[PDB]
Design a binder for this molecule. Structure first.
Ligand SMILES: *[C@@H]1O[C@H](CO)[C@@H](O[C@@H]2O[C@H](CO)[C@@H](O[C@@H]3O[C@H](CO)[C@@H](O)[C@H](O[C@H]4O[C@H](CO)[C@@H](O)[C@H](O)[C@@H]4O[C@H]4O[C@H](CO)[C@@H](O)[C@H](O)[C@@H]4O)[C@@H]3O)[C@H](O)[C@H]2NC(C)=O)[C@H](O)[C@H]1NC(C)=O
Ligand SMILES: Cc1cc2nc3c(=O)[nH]c(=O)nc-3n(C[C@H](O)[C@H](O)[C@H](O)COP(=O)(O)OP(=O)(O)OC[C@H]3O[C@@H](n4cnc5c(N)ncnc54)[C@H](O)[C@@H]3O)c2cc1C
Ligand SMILES: *[C@@H]1O[C@H](CO)[C@@H](O)[C@H](O)[C@H]1NC(C)=O
Ligand SMILES: *[C@@H]1O[C@H](CO)[C@@H](O)[C@H](O)[C@H]1NC(C)=O
Ligand SMILES: *[C@@H]1O[C@H](CO)[C@@H](O)[C@H](O)[C@H]1NC(C)=O
Ligand SMILES: *[C@@H]1O[C@H](CO)[C@@H](O)[C@H](O)[C@H]1NC(C)=O
Length: 581
């Protein structure tokens, strides 16, 4: 079936011209591929490092098997630099295959706070990037299924208004066929008790309180990976071509005009085993935020100071790779009594004051008075290059927290036999970078530094959120199911205070694999790399369409907006295509 249509032979595409070349077959790349080829005169070639894996078996198809694939070849596992917070290397899990990280994520489907997306337009000057517009496309990509009696009974709430049911991404309640755990509702009572909302539909634009949510899976529980949703139904499209197992090394730029123009791409597996394919219209980079920026740097698009020592000629000087925003994750795990047995996941989207509790006052002084200092510090560390532009982003976050009271922490609960909390501070103030460390793209020698916890609010923010998760595990209704803390367990005193948690955390956290921002959609003056249409500044025919582009973090799981985002850019591209005649 699909597997026979994928090209695995580099020579099947070398020297050919297609209208669009999409570097990366992941969530954004396949969504775009399928959108463009809807127009039969538009020929697309997707070049993906991995191959087809959606039908491989449960390791891919069962969301309940989440994490088993880490380390296999469907895991790019990029390692960070030796992190300064703990002097360790972290591994960035990243799907390698058709569907990219949709092949390995947990499938959570939720949406951000509308003030957040709105800020893309008002603060970042991205005309058209507002909630109304973005939520519109999001509903357009969605094929939500309403929860049944048992699912509602368990704690599910679905506002129909907030969901599309004619889309492409099959989404619905995960259901292992087993009974749901009483613990979901027990968590809802514990938060209700402290005045936190519950059962608010997270796809509505106000992700707050504790709610259950849909997952990208068909009713049959099979993963709605991007390849299964947009490629599988469409692989027979003669204008859709996908080369597997090859690496896009860099964009070919013709420089005999007023502006360099992206002409095609170079791909291969090794220095000396490369091939060139060309594009009539444009090169769309969709290799993920850890790699689209390096593709640009290998190409002469990036800062002269990085490019120059590597022997690369800088064609366009832009702050490629700066502004990386990823989250830190910490676990709190507690054993439960047999009474709490069953399946179920829920998340508390806690606001600033709910995260910090008694420290809200303190936490607030910081937000209010450290903005500039923090901005100079992150700039000094290479996370960004312009303090003022950085400041504006901080002021934007102060605004969302202070005036829109968006969710600052995410406490994700996993039951299925334990009460396991994965907690992450959703709005990091730290800025990291990603820069190539060599001129050969196939050496894959790059420095990825998310600078986790180099900003004090982030550390405290993560310490408070995790401490919160220990607190609710054993509060109110939760208490009846609690049967002893497993992790940290003996590694951290139960009665640990915020500082103790602060000290513990840099050594017991993992990246959240939600890195965005390395090719930021913001005006060039503000440190942006791409315009409101995802076009790289100063180059013709080059777009960056993936997680590299959101200029901010979001209080949600990103798939909903990333599919919305790929759809909106595809429209943009369609318009430019009909113009390019
Ligand atoms: C990540 O790794 C890096 C290194 O790769 C870590 O950074 C290094 O950290 C060490 C300390 O952890 C630091 O070494 C100190 O340098 C000081 C110079 O500013 C020295 O004064 C200091 O020496 C004192 O302590 C030593 C260790 O106990 C003694 O051997 C020494 O004789 C000195 O002792 C005097 O002072 C101490 C306390 O002030 C006192 O207890 C003594 O009685 C006496 O009065 C160390 O040599 C390095 O400079 C750091 N940087 C570099 C580049 O190496 C980093 O901290 C790691 N991060 C994490 C999270 O672990
Ligand atoms: C472990 C994990 C958990 C996650 N959890 C969630 C969750 O529960 N819910 C949520 O909403 N989202 C989650 N996400 C994030 C979401 O999956 C990603 O944000 C989204 O997939 C990013 O889309 P993208 O198009 O930027 O890139 P990707 O999907 O990463 O795709 C990039 C594609 O490029 C291919 N590629 C890489 N380098 C090259 C190269 N040189 N050439 C060609 N192809 C290349 C990759 O192999 C991949 O297929 C998770 C991510 C991970 C890794
Ligand atoms: C469904 O969501 C929309 C939010 O835009 C709201 O206006 C509508 O009344 C919601 N209903 C409930 C009961 O949440
Ligand atoms: C979905 O599509 C079908 C048929 O083409 C239509 O009947 C239905 O109204 C659509 N739903 C919405 C709300 O767009
Ligand atoms: C949060 O607490 C701060 C003071 O600590 C207060 O100024 C603010 O009004 C509080 N509430 C919300 C909902 O922001
Ligand atoms: C720094 O950013 C500010 C705020 O966007 C902008 O006005 C200014 O032009 C930037 N400085 C440089 C040198 O780009």
């Amino acid at each position: 079936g699909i597997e026979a249509s994928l090209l695995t032979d580099p020579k099947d595409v070398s020297g050919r011209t297609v209208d669009y070349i999409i570097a990366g077959g992941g969530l954004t790349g396949l969504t775009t591929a399928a959108r463009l080829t809807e127009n039969p005169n538009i020929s697309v070639l997707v070049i993906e490092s991995g191959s087809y894996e959606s039908d491989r078996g449960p390791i891919i198809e069962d969301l309940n098997a989440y994490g088993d694939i880490f380390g296999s070849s469907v895991d790019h596992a990029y390692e960070t630099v030796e992190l300064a917070t703990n002097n360790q290397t972290a591994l960035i899990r990243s799907g390698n295959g058709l569907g990219g990280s949709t092949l390995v994520n947990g499938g959570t489907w939720t949406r951000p706070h509308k003030a957040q997306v709105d800020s893309w337009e008002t603060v970042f000057g991205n005309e058209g990037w507002n909630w109304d517009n973005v939520a519109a496309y999001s509903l357009q990509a969605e094929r939500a299924r309403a929860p049944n009696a048992k699912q509602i009974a368990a704690g599910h709430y679905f506002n129909a208004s907030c969901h599309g049911v004619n889309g492409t991404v099959h989404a619905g309640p995960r259901d292992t066929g087993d009974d749901y755990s009483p613990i979901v509702k027990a968590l809802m009572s514990a938060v209700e008790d402290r005045g936190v909302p519950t059962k608010k539909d997270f796809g509505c634009g106000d992700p707050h309180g504790v709610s259950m949510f849909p997952n990208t899976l068909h009713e049959d529980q099979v993963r709605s990976d991007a390849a299964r949703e947009w490629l599988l139904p469409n692989y027979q499209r003669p204008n859709l071509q996908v080369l597997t197992g090859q690496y896009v090394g860099k964009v070919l730029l013709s420089q005999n005009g007023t502006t360099p123009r992206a002409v095609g791409v170079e791909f291969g597996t090794h220095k000396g085993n490369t091939h060139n394919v060309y594009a009539k219209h444009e090169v769309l980079l969709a290799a993920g935020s850890a790699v689209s920026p390096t593709i640009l740097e290998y190409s002469g698009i990036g800062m002269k100071s990085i490019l120059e020592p590597l022997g690369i000629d800088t064609v366009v000087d832009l702050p490629v790779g700066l502004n990386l925003q990823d989250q830190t994750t910490a676990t709190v795990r507690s054993r439960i009594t047999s009474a709490g047995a069953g399946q179920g996941q829920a998340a508390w989207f806690a606001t600033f004051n709910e995260t910090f509790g008694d420290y809200s006052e303190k936490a607030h002084e910081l937000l209010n008075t450290k903005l500039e200092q923090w901005a100079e510090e992150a700039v000094a560390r290479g996370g960004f290059h312009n303090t003022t532009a950085l400041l504006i982003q901080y002021e934007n976050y102060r605004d969302w927290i202070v005036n829109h009271n968006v969710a600052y922490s995410e406490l994700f609960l996993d039951t299925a036999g334990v009460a396991s909390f994965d907690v992450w501070d959703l709005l990091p103030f730290t800025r990291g970078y990603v820069h190539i460390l060599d001129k050969d793209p196939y050496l894959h020698h790059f420095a990825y530094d998310p600078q986790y916890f180099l900003n004090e609010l982030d550390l405290l923010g993560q310490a408070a959120a995790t401490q919160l998760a220990r607190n609710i595990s054993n509060s109110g209704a939760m208490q009846t199911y609690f049967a002893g803390e497993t992790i940290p367990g003996d590694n951290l005193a139960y009665d640990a205070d915020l500082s103790a948690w602060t000290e513990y955390i840099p050594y017991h956290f993992r990246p959240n694999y939600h890195g965005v921002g390395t090719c930021s959609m913001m005006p060039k003056e503000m440190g942006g790399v791409v315009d409101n249409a995802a076009r790289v500044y100063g180059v013709q025919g080059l777009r960056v369409i993936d997680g590299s582009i959101p200029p901010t973090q979001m209080s949600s799981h990103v798939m909903t907006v990333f599919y919305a985002m790929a759809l909106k850019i595809s429209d943009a591209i369609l318009e430019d295509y009909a113009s390019m005649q």
